[PDB]
Every structure is written in C-alpha cells, then in structure tokens.
Amino acid sequence: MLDDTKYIQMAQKFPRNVSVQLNKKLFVTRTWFRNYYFVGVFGIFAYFIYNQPKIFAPFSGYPTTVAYKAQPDFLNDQVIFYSQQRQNTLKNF
Amino acid sequence: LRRKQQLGKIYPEEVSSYTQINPDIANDLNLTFNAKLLWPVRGMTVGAGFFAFAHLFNLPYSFRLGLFVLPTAVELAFTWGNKTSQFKSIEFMDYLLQYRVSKALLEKNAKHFAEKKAAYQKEINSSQSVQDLYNQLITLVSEQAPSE
Ligand SMILES: CCCCCCCCCCCCCCCCCC(=O)OC[C@H](COP(=O)(O)OCCN)OC(=O)CCCCCCCCCCCCCCCCC
C-alpha cells in the first residue's frame, strides 16, 4: 500500500471559501491559442475526413438530375424545351 | 469530357440564357472547367480584416500572416473539389447541346419558312410557340367540341 497519508488529509480538509480572481486577458489568450490550434490544425484533418469521400464518391450525394429535349419554333425563332427527371447514375463505365 | 467535347466551346450568352433555371451557373461552371484562375477573394478579404484587427491590437507579424493564410486556406478548401458543380455543369451542357441543335435546325430551314412565317405573323398577334398553342387548341377541342 502507498503511504497516501498527506494526500488523504488534503482531500478530507480543504478550504471552502478560498478563491482567486482570474486575469480575463490571460484566460482569453490561452483559450484563443487553443482555438488557433483546433481550427487551423485539427480543422485540416476534420475537413479532409468530411470531404475526401465527397470528392471520390460524388454520385451518392446528387441523387436526382434533369435531362432536356429541344424542338425548334421557326415562326417565332424560339426553342422549346421538355424536361425530365432522372436518377443520377453511372454511365459509360 | 465527352459532353464538353461535343459542345466544343461555351459562350457567355448561353450561360446567361440558362441562368433562368440555375442562377449560380457561372459560379458552378467556373468550378468545373479550367476557364479562369480563381483567387479566394473572400478569404483574402477576411484575412485583411484579421490583419487590421491584429495591427490594432499589436500582435506579432507571424500571427497576422498565419491569420491571413488561414481564411485563404478555408476559402480554397471550400472552393476546389465540389463535384456537385460538375453535375450541374453536365445538366447545363445537355441543355446547351439541345438548344444548339434546335438553333441549327432553325437556321437550316429558315429560308423554307420565310413565306409561311410572313403569312403567320400577320394573322396571329401572339409570340407564343406553335406547339403550346396547338396543345391548347387540342385540349379546347377535346373539351368543348361536340363528339357528334
Ligand atoms: C455569416 C455570418 C458569419 C459571422 C462570423 C463571425 C465570426 C466572429 C469571429 C470572432 C473572432 C474573435 C477573435 C478574438 C481573438 C482574441 C485574442 C486575444 O485576446 O489574445 C491576444 C493574443 C496576443 O498574442 P501575444 O503573442 O501574447 O501578443 C501580445 C499582444 N498584446 O493573441 C494570441 O495569442 C493569438 C490569438 C489567435 C486567435 C485565433 C483566431 C481563430 C479564429 C477562427 C474562426 C473560425 C470561424 C469559422 C467560420 C466558418 C463559416 C463557414
């Protein structure tokens, strides 16, 4: 057994009215260093994990697409379009 | 690549034409094709704002250079890739190919329809297409015309 006598005493008897004021500026400085090392360092890894599948597996993110057919309108010099909904699928393996 | 090869080249008039159904067609067609070099202007502006903040608060120059790079990096990351823009480009290119084919058919037969067009403009004051008017007429006949 470890002789934890002094630590046991510390745990049993601790002040219950002692507190220290914290310099807001230094607290903010440390926290914003933490944010700097999160957004700009771990953000790279997080964004890679989130996006790389969306780059190498794009077809699963855009399920439905549209296709068009066109006809002329000679007497008005216009073009008439008919649309169609399709399931976005692979093509020409 | 196959669709773009069939189209060959794209002119701004057609892009603005298709803007009706996809207001971000230019913003999507830039991210699919190597048309022009894209600078992360929004990212650089945010970086300049952070630079002004640091200059006001007297931060070391390393911090402000890093805070200029970071928003630029975010802008680049959110700009490149974006394979959805390729799907939208495919849709636009299909539309453009159909439009160009129909336009070629218009030009090819323009002389043949000159006389009929001249006769038609003087009788119908509407600019609506012949197909739409004929479908409406067919519905009108199917509804009101007595079967007899
Ligand atoms: C559509 C609407 C969107 C609206 C968005 C709004 C965003 C608001 C963002 C507010 C940011 C406030 C940043 C405040 C930083 C304060 C830093 C500070 O108090 O500490 C100063 C300290 C000085 O450093 P020192 O070397 O000790 O020099 C002594 C100088 N007296 O400095 C340091 O030690 C270095 C501090 C580094 C700070 C890093 C900041 C990183 C910010 C990341 C933001 C990410 C946002 C992502 C948004 C995505 C949107 C798609």
Residue numbers in the entry:
A (entry chain CK): 1 to 93
B (entry chain CF): 149 to 296
Sentences from the paper on this structure:
The ETC consists of four multisubunit membrane complexes: complex I (CI; NADH:ubiquinone (UQ) oxidoreductase), complex II (CII; succinate:UQ oxidoreductase), complex III (CIII; cytochrome bc1) and complex IV (CIV; cytochrome c oxidase). We purified the intact respiratory supercomplex from mitochondria of the ciliate protist Tetrahymena thermophila and determined its structure by single-particle cryo-electron microscopy (cryo-EM).
CII transfers electrons from succinate via its covalently bound flavin adenine dinucleotide (FAD) and iron–sulfur clusters to UQ and is also a component of the tricarboxylic acid cycle, making a functional link between the two central metabolic pathways. T. thermophila CII binds in a wedge-shaped gap formed by CI–CIV in our structure. The matrix module SDHA and SDHB forms a conserved head region, containing both the covalently bound FAD and the three iron–sulfur clusters. The membrane anchor is formed by two small subunits, SDHC (7 kDa) and mitochondria-encoded SDHD (5 kDa), which could only be assigned by locating topologically conserved transmembrane helices in the map. Between SDHB and SDHD, we identified a ligand, which we assign to ubiquinone bound to the conserved proximal Qp site. On the matrix side, the 36-kDa soluble subunit SDHTT1 contains a bis-histidine C-type haem covalently bound by a single cysteine residue. Although it is exposed to the membrane region, at a distance of approximately 60 Å from the Fe3S4 cluster, the non-canonical haem C is located too far to participate in direct CII electron transfer. Furthermore, the tubular membrane morphology may require anchoring of CII to the curved supercomplex to retain it in the functionally relevant cristae and prevent diffusion to flat membrane regions.
